Amino acid sequence: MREVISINVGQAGCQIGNACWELYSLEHGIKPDGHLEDGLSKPKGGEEGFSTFFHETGYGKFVPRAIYVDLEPNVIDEVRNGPYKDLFHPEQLISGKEDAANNYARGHYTVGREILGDVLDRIRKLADQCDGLQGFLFTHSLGGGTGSGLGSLLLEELSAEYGKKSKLEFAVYPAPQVSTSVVEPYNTVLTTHTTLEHADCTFMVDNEAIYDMCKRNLDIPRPSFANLNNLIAQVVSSVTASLRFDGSLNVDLNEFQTNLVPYPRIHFPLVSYSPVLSKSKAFHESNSVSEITNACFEPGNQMVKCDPRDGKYMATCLLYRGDVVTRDVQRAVEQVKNKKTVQLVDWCPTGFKIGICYEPPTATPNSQLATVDRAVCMLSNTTSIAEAWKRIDRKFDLMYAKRAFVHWYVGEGMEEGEFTEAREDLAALERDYIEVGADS
Amino acid sequence: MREIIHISTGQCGNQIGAAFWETICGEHGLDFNGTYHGHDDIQKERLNVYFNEASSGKWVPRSINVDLEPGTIDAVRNSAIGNLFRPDNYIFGQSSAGNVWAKGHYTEGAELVDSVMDVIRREAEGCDSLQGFQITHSLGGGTGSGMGTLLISKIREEFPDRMMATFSVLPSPKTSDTVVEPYNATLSVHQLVEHSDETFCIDNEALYDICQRTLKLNQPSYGDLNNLVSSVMSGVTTSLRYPGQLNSDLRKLAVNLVPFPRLHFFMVGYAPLTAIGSQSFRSLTVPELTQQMFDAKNMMAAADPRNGRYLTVAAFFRGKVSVKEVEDEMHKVQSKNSDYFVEWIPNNVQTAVCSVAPQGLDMAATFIANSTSIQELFKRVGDQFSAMFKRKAFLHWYTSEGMDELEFSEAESNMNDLVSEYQQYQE
Numbered sequence A: 001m002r003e004v005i006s007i008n009v010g011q012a013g014c015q016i017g018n019a020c021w022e023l024y025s026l027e028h029g030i031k032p033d034g035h036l037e038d039g040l041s042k043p044k045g046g047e048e049g050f051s052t053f054f055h056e057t058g059y060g061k062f063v064p065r066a067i068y069v070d071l072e073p074n075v076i077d078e079v080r081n082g083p084y085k086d087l088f089h090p091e092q093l094i095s096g097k098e099d100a101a102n103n104y105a106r107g108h109y110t111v112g113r114e115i116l117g118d119v120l121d122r123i124r125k126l127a128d129q130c131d132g133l134q135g136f137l138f139t140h141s142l143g144g145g146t147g148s149g150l151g152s153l154l155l156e157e158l159s160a161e162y163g164k165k166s167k168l169e170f171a172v173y174p175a176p177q178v179s180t181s182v183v184e185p186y187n188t189v190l191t192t193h194t195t196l197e198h199a200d201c202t203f204m205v206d207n208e209a210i211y212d213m214c215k216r217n218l219d220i221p222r223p224s225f226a227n228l229n230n231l232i233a234q235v236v237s238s239v240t241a242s243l244r245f246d247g248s249l250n251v252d253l254n255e256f257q258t259n260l261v262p263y264p265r266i267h268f269p270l271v272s273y274s275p276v277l278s279k280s281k282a283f284h285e286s287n288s289v290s291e292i293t294n295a296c297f298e299p300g301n302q303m304v305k306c307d308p309r310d311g312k313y314m315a316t317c318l319l320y321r322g323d324v325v326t327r328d329v330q331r332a333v334e335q336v337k338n339k340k341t342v343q344l345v346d347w348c349p350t351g352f353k354i355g356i357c358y359e360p361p362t363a364t365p366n367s368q369l370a371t372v373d374r375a376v377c378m379l380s381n382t383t384s385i386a387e388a389w390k391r392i393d394r395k396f397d398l399m400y401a402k403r404a405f406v407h408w409y410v411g412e413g414m415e416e417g418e419f420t421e422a423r424e425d426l427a428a429l430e431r432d433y434i435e436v437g438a439d440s
Numbered sequence B: 001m002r003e004i005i006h007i008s009t010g011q012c013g014n015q016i017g018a019a020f021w022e023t024i025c026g027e028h029g030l031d032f033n034g035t036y037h038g039h040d041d042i043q044k045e046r047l048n049v050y051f052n053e054a055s056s057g058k059w060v061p062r063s064i065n066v067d068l069e070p071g072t073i074d075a076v077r078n079s080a081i082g083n084l085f086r087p088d089n090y091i092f093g094q095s096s097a098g099n100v101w102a103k104g105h106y107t108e109g110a111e112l113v114d115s116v117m118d119v120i121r122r123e124a125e126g127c128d129s130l131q132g133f134q135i136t137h138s139l140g141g142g143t144g145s146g147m148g149t150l151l152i153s154k155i156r157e158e159f160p161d162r163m164m165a166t167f168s169v170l171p172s173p174k175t176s177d178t179v180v181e182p183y184n185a186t187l188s189v190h191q192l193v194e195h196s197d198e199t200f201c202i203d204n205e206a207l208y209d210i211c212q213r214t215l216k217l218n219q220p221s222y223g224d225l226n227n228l229v230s231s232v233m234s235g236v237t238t239s240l241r242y243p244g245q246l247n248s249d250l251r252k253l254a255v256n257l258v259p260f261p262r263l264h265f266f267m268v269g270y271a272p273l274t275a276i277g278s279q280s281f282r283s284l285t286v287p288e289l290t291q292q293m294f295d296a297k298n299m300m301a302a303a304d305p306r307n308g309r310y311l312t313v314a315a316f317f318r319g320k321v322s323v324k325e326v327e328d329e330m331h332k333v334q335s336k337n338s339d340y341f342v343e344w345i346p347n348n349v350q351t352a353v354c355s356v357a358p359q360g361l362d363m364a365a366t367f368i369a370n371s372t373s374i375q376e377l378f379k380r381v382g383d384q385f386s387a388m389f390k391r392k393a394f395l396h397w398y399t400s401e402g403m404d405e406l407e408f409s410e411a412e413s414n415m416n417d418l419v420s421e422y423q424q425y426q427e
């Protein structure tokens, strides 16, 4: 398919989107002024890569297909004054004059609905321009006010309008240990209620795990949100790499849904990025396909705080980039299967889908990730993910027993039975996840 | 939620307001004649928060200075910084309230009222989007308590959906200067719990203790204490006028810090604090700032924070700060000292970051804690109040203005209810 539209909601989502678009422009060789200079033609800066995101306007200037929604104007003002202010159409940035605090009820039911029609119209115009729309790509903060509420509301409306388009969601989850928001679990549960019924594929990232990767693997002493965002952006880029460049086995988003989603629910894979190598250690590494595959299943190279060894693997997909032999990849996958820690469920004879893209990965200057001739992204459905949900649920329960912060949500036009319903639905989702994943 | 309106009430409130405006002008680079000195994009864009731009590029603060004693406002108008204020925002009557909450609340307070409300309406019309109100006064005065509470009632009546953030200066348990201060304070809290959205409690004795203990002072002055309060005020609203990593809002403060409508009261703390000349022997580290903020000597309320239990905490860092560092140190404090944090709420503390540093330091932090220890203060005053009300001493000054004993009894009952609820959540 041709075109994909990115949608960023909230502070975190907009920052991630900035990093992602910077990375895409670097890969295709697009100037911060929106110019095909940096190489002008061929899949890096060519119609292959230009289709999917970037839209060629008059005078050969390229404007990405991107939509920024924030109820807080400060973030989008900061973007408007930054170097990449030039890249995108000024009318694609949509700013509200009141925050949602961290309150999912205002973004969903009151202050967010004031912007909803405008952003829907923007999406409709951009979709009209798109010749062969494949689907949408969402950047959220799960647990916030704008990302949660406006993200869920917008996603539901978009699904109602289009409905046969593939809907991807890349969400930033609450942290099992150290979190920055007192009511975050309330928002997260409420949002999962809708996300389970609308999003086709959801990717979850825990900031704690990315911090662990920055401090341990990259040995970064003082990591910043920017470096985390760079890692996540590289993951997303490698997801769309099979769409933007030629290769051996070209994976679509529909293929991801097909091989990774056995039932309508259980659409929540974990993600991992194996070659995380410090520029200090860049000359002590082999970069062998087998070694990278082994790094994939190492918990230190996983981007969620979850132990995949505690559960059973349902289905996985590896995505290779750069100079990689198919036979080598197959042998590595066979070795991993023989390890037996995978614990492949009985239904799946293989459960390992391999994509191969012939383009090498690249990294932004601010990161310690050194350039490598091959890279891997790992998307895996495991039963262990239930753990995270359980954690969230527990943190919800303790508050909801005393109706801790409820009045802040109820004053904005919410019901108590809505909380009970969302929590019940989350519990049912966890229960069915364990039920199928155990006896699959 | 862009424009904020500042209202100072009484002698103390007006003095604190002067210090606060001086600090804000220093942060934004404004001359005391209203013409800006520096304007940098971080300073220049968000000038609209506290300031309106008058014709010819002169900036005037959106502020209202009210008292019943003309001398204070005269002194303000003759000070340098007297030029900044548009002369229409000074409002005062001739006859003071003495120190009687009743006079300022209806009898002699009704002398002004409507004029203040009119200038509030004019300021509200002049702002694109109102965010909230900052009300600086002293609990336990005649003008600051009575007129302040009345004004808060009127403002919430007209603007019910705007944030009311009050900075209250409470009585001190060791040797206060005013005799009938307990009566005024109780009467004021009666209304304050029904109107104010968030009230930051500060007492002068804790400030003095900071002055002499950590800062090794020789004879502090009121302006010195006012500078501390002004720094805290600046720290609260930093994320509104400046960019950052985790931005915050007044509604967000209320949501994170208010489990129940009846617990809106907060303790504040500030870091760092080091006496003159030993600045060279210090290192500014996020761990050190955290240690400073949870130290009981650095509480600005006279309650013992180790005695109570923390419900909800909001920390705000400024300057060169990693979010990861703040997460680490915060969680260390949570785990080590977990006896002080209520188990009912798993997320006890939330963090905010602003990249701009306060003038004079590369790093600093403000600390807002909702703890059960605050009940102690409510108890102390309560006891005093009850004692005097047993003898009905000084009552004639109040009842001569139209007061009734039923009102005083209701106020004491409300105080007891507050203490009881804080005890309930202490558990």
Ligand SMILES: C/C(=C\c1csc(C)n1)[C@@H]1C[C@@H]2O[C@@H]2CCC[C@H](C)[C@H](O)[C@@H](C)C(=O)C(C)(C)[C@@H](O)CC(=O)O1
Binding pocket: B211, B214, B215, B216, B217, B220, B221, B224, B225, B227, B228, B231, B272, B273, B274, B275, B276, B279, B282
């Ligand atoms: C300069 C200060 C701390 C500091 C500098 S380097 C470091 C590690 N800490 C803080 C700043 C706080 O805003 C408060 C000013 C408080 C002034 C005092 C109440 C008093 O007026 C003054 C005469 C003092 O005692 C000091 C001058 C010692 C003042 O520096 C105290 C202090 O630490 O202030």
Ligand SMILES: Nc1nc2c(ncn2[C@@H]2O[C@H](COP(=O)(O)OP(=O)(O)OP(=O)(O)O)[C@@H](O)[C@H]2O)c(=O)[nH]1
Binding pocket: A009, A010, A011, A012, A013, A015, A016, A071, A072, A099, A100, A101, A102, A141, A142, A143, A144, A145, A146, A147, A148, A172, A173, A174, A180, A181, A207, A225, A226, A228, A229, B245, B246, B247
């Ligand atoms: N990866 C990443 N996570 C972030 C970033 N900023 C915040 N977060 C996380 O997202 C949550 C904070 O959400 P907020 O940024 O306050 O808010 P929001 O969801 O964008 O919505 P608003 O509150 O309306 O601005 C916490 O989990 C943060 O640790 C960022 O730049 N990158």
Ligand SMILES: Nc1nc2c(ncn2[C@@H]2O[C@H](COP(=O)(O)OP(=O)(O)O)[C@@H](O)[C@H]2O)c(=O)[nH]1
Binding pocket: B009, B010, B011, B012, B013, B015, B016, B098, B099, B138, B139, B140, B141, B142, B143, B144, B145, B169, B170, B171, B176, B177, B178, B204, B222, B223, B225, B226
């Ligand atoms: N922090 C501080 N407290 C003050 C100041 N002036 C008075 N107070 C306190 O306020 C109380 C006295 O009330 P007062 O200001 O005279 O009230 P008014 O009659 O309404 O102006 C006592 O607690 C004082 O210590 C000041 O400039 N700063």
